[PDB]
Design a protein around this nucleic acid. Structure first.
Ligand SMILES: [Zn+2]
Ligand SMILES: [Zn+2]
Lengths: 82, 93, 148, 85, 109, 99, 99, 83, 94, 108
DNA sequence: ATCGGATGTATATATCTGACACGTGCCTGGAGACTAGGGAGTAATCCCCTTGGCGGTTAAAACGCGGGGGACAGCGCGTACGTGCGTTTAAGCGGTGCTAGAGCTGTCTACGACCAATTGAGCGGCCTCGGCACCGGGATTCTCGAT
DNA sequence: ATCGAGAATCCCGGTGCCGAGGCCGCTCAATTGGTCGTAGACAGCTCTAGCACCGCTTAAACGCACGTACGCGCTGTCCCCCGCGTTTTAACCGCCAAGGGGATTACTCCCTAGTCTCCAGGCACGTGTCAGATATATACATCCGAT
């Protein structure tokens, strides 16, 4: 069992993502909000991925399930299949 | 002339189930017909895509169940799955 | 119209410097239809043969290729009995810069070595790939009676 | 330098270059021939068969198809043929 | 069940099972269609229709009326949470909008 | 006496550096652990192909970068240069992610 | 001596009035003429069913109402109550309409 | 039977009413031109698809169903006119 | 051995060797190209299917594909793509 | 066009007409499939592929490389008015983002 | 902190009209019985890749500190927008007339699905050599404290 | 307006490795030839509603005047991110070992498509009556200036 792994997304990683996004200066409360929204997005995608896997009577979540979930939500991904 | 099919009478029956006193106008009937058609198209398309992905050629009740799980939000999906399972169990015997 | 000037330039360039073992000209009054004759290449089993063919110019020239058809009968893997030719220059890779001289030279070079990758007649091509002697003999037998 | 008249000839219509466009493959042909092949053929270079579909699309909406330097040189050194062409 | 009455009555529903079966078969979804899929689909459609109609009837009764108009349907759909998410991109004709005013725009006390 | 850059001229350097590269910015193992935790919250005793985790990482990073671009525009709109949680909330609300 | 309301009360009164009704807020004839003009720009000699024009009007009005809501939120973000064209542009960009 | 600059028929009071429905209290004076441009763009985008749909069916009158299909294709489902 | 899986890699490389006769392509770029081709195929073939269903037809003809290309391609691309397809059909019948 | 040759060469295309025809017929799209539809669809697909490949090759040449990588694909797609519009929601794996710094943030 | 106008909204009553709800004729689509074959379920087997662990080394994260630039609050100005009134414009409604075009029906001819034999295009596997990654040294170029 | 020192980034040359491209073998799906049932192309007729016009209200749009309150610029305070140095933590890479489950193959049976016959459920059409919209007259909440 695992617990409290959202802190693995550290402050430097969020700063790097902001720099790539074109952000010059960051406040101090950004990190918790970013962690929350990332967690919500991950939950939404993984729910559909696990549903797709469960329908196929499988026990492994293949990359194609993730691709199908992302396409369903409107976030088509190129490179991993399809 | 030509005959046009619609879900008007079934919608009226369900309305008389839920609210025996209230009526319904024509525009509300048109809106409900459009809603039913849209949900039918969504669920059928999702079930067909699910069958195609798994290299199948038939649409059974489990494809419909998984499509309902994928489309409807949490509580709505749970209640819809319960109602569909109940109807299938009642019909099959 | 525009294609006509290209036709006169083609005819003039063919007349001033005729190519080797081939000669083409206007068979009819109109400039679209042409007749051509070709002499068998020296290093080939078609020795002494002379062959006739017809050239049909499309109404849209030079941006669409012309169609060439053998008048006589020939034993070649790339040519049927009715004169159809399987050449990529005429259909697959025609370009406006190409001239009738180039396509005629390519047709002449086809008789030097048949193309076995995409034969229009698979059976005689397989015969040729089986033994060269039998293909040479049957080609000679055909050409001493049809060409001459 | 100055190109000679022998190498200042359009390959398709065998005439003098009229608004000569130069393809990315460094093959030059007059504008009417290029337009005719674009609108009536496979949209490639007639000389070496290198398709320029994206290049043609990007240069046909800015009216930059025609090469200006070569056209000016031709029109200056050979003004006689343009009038009769 | 009895295998003697109409298919919808046998399934206990009011939506047509035969029409849903025909629409699934002729709709170009799959080469074959199962025997229990139309029952499930009809049950789901009937449940959703019943929910929306109940909410619209409540909204109409709150307005001292005995007929659901598109305004009542819009109120019922928007005031809910799951139904609003399900029909987020849908526009209801003659439905209007929910009344709300931002706190900043209100007059100062 | 030691040489120090003025505050702001190293941030633009990192902006130019990270917009020119193409690697992944979040570490692999913590992200994999987080994905596994969420998945086991959904369904127990699951297994993951490596390509699935990589696809999830790519999608998450792209989403975060786009959200940060929109947040930066929102912050500039209000006549500032820092990005604050209200900027993220407004961008998400306008995009329709929370309404 | 004459009585008049302070600037702001009538605006809120109109806000409360127009959020309670359901009718169309644009006159039918000018919108029909504009639709016909655009259609003529696309393909000449077209005829329009009345239901088509009504559906077009409903869709356009709903779109404009949503856009004005987003514009109001953008304006309120910048510590203002007026809505300005930059608010409309930001709302359109964040929504992804023009990117 | 051509028509010219009919977009001025979307008068300022109409835009004010639409903003009031949207929940706007105070409006700048330069909103109207921007709103007119946005409405023109939206109308052009929808009508182009509607005309394409009516052209495919070999017809000369645009029906409500073509408009509904175009709106659904753009991603804005409309209830109350069929479908 | 592994079962046969189909892809557009050979045709994509054949097309690439036309625009640039001296430029190679990485494996991941081919994986992205194949996905793009599949996505566009699905889009066009679904739009054409719905378009044929609207008018109560049973056949997907070249007219439906042309109208679908018109519908889902932005501006200039459509004006070009349609043309190409037309020429191909004109070169296939005759 | 004369018969007795592969279908993809009669139309002059490089994409397979036969495979496209099979996919259209067996994909549960319609009851019947016309004879000219696969040719049209294959021609459109080949045109789009050629366009993107040419733009990506130009982008790769601008980077002194002789091999197309996903970064070059992203650069080609996002620098074009129409391809960006068509591939709007599409995410290219390991493609990065275009360099863009807002004018306000630059030093004065 | 109220107090009095003054305005606008909400409430109760008569009435009358057209749209909703129900009944009837019927015909086209749904139900019932029967047949055949192909799709999917089930059992068995192979081996691929997913999990788990250990050791090192080192790039990356956490902690702390000086401080300078940016966020936020407060004031003043003046101009643009809200509110109200008189005037002019064209939307809305009713009524009539005409015909272009949508909609339905009958013939039938050419396009497309099905079936069987055949073989060549394309997929799986191997191998190698050049393009790209990396390292080390040097030249170029923004940056900032000091004039 | 600038000169110069410390620091980050770009060029160039040499070395190595691994995967991209080309070739070989083979199996299965695309090609070719023929047949046959049916869909939609076309011609013809009906009749619906889309278009055009005209007259009369009166409601919404327009223009103008006055005032006030809100947007914008400016100054000031302070405090919190930023840049840099040092130490701690665990990610990454390479290696080994086990076996769980994904993927393939064979056999069988039963579930669904196709067909024919039969009949009743829902659709179009017609009609009654009452739910709600409109007009008219009070009752009360609320806004604003002034004490
Ligand atoms: Zn020329
Ligand atoms: Zn060239």
């Amino acid at each position: 069992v695992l617990r409290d792994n959202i802190q693995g997304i550290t402050k430097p990683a969020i700063r790097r993502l902001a720099r790539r996004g074109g952000v010059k200066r960051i406040s101090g409360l950004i990190y918790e909000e970013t962690r929350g929204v990332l967690k919500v997005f991950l939950e939404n995608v993984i729910r559909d991925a696990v549903t797709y896997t469960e329908h196929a009577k499988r026990k492994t979540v293949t990359a194609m399930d993730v691709v199908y979930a992302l396409k369903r939500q409107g976030r088509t991904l190129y490179g991993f299949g399809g | 002339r030509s005959r046009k099919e619609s879900y008007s009478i079934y919608v009226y029956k369900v309305l008389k189930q839920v609210h025996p006193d209230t009526g319904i106008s024509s525009k509300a009937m048109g809106i409900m017909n459009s809603f039913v058609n849209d949900i039918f198209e969504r669920i059928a398309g999702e079930a067909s895509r699910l069958a195609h992905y798994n290299k199948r050629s038939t649409i059974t009740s489990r494809e419909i169940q998984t499509a309902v799980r994928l489309l409807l939000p949490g509580e709505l999906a749970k209640h819809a799955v319960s109602e569909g399972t109940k109807a299938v169990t009642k019909y099959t015997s | 119209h525009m294609a006509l000037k290209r036709i006169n330039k083609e005819l003039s360039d063919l007349a001033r410097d005729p190519p080797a073992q081939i000669s083409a000209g206007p068979v009819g009054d109109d400039m679209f239809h042409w007749q051509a004759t070709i002499m068998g290449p020296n290093d080939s089993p078609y020795q002494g043969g002379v062959f006739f063919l017809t050239i049909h110019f499309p109404t849209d020239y030079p941006f669409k290729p012309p169609k060439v058809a053998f008048t006589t009968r020939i034993y070649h893997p790339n040519i049927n009995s009715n004169g159809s030719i399987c050449l990529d220059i005429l259909r697959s890779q025609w370009s406006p810069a190409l001239t009738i001289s180039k396509v005629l030279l390519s047709i002449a070079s086809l008789l030097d070595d048949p193309n076995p990758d995409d034969p229009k007649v698979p059976e005689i091509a397989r015969i040729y790939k089986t033994d060269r002697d039998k293909y040479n003999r049957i080609s000679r037998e055909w050409t001493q009676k049809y060409a001459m | 330098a100055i190109p000679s008249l022998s190498e200042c000839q359009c390959g398709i219509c065998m005439e003098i270059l009229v608004e000569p466009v130069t393809l990315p493959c460094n093959h030059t042909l007059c504008k009417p021939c290029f337009q005719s092949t674009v609108e009536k053929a496979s949209l490639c270079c007639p000389f070496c068969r290198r398709r320029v579909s994206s290049w043609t699309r990007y240069h046909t909406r800015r009216n930059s198809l025609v090469n200006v330097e070569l056209w000016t040189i031709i029109q200056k050194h050979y003004p006689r043929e343009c009038k009769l062409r | 069940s009895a295998k003697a009455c109409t298919r919808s009555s046998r399934a206990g529903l009011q939506f047509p099972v035969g029409r849903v079966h025909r629409l699934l078969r002729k709709g170009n979804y799959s080469e074959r269609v199962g025997a229990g899929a139309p029952v499930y689909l009809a049950a789901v459609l009937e449940y959703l229709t019943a929910e929306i109609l109940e909410l619209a009837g409540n909204a109409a009764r709150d307005n001292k009326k005995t007929r659901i108009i598109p305004r009542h349907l819009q109120l019922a759909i928007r005031n809910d949470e799951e139904l609003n998410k399900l029909l987020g991109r849908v526009t209801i004709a003659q439905g209007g909008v929910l009344p709300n005013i931002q706190a900043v725009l209100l007059p100062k006390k | 006496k030691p040489h120090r850059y003025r505050p702001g001229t190293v941030a633009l350097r990192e902006i130019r550096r990270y917009q020119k590269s193409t690697e992944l910015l979040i570490r692999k193992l913590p992200f994999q652990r987080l994905v596994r935790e969420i998945a086991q919250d959904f369904k127990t005793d699951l297994r993951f192909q490596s390509s699935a985790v990589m696809a999830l990482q790519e999608a998450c990073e792209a989403y975060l970068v786009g959200l940060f671009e929109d947040t930066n525009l929102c912050a500039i709109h209000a006549k500032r240069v820092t990005i604050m949680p209200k900027d993220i909330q407004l961008a998400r609300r306008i995009r329709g992610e929370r309404a």
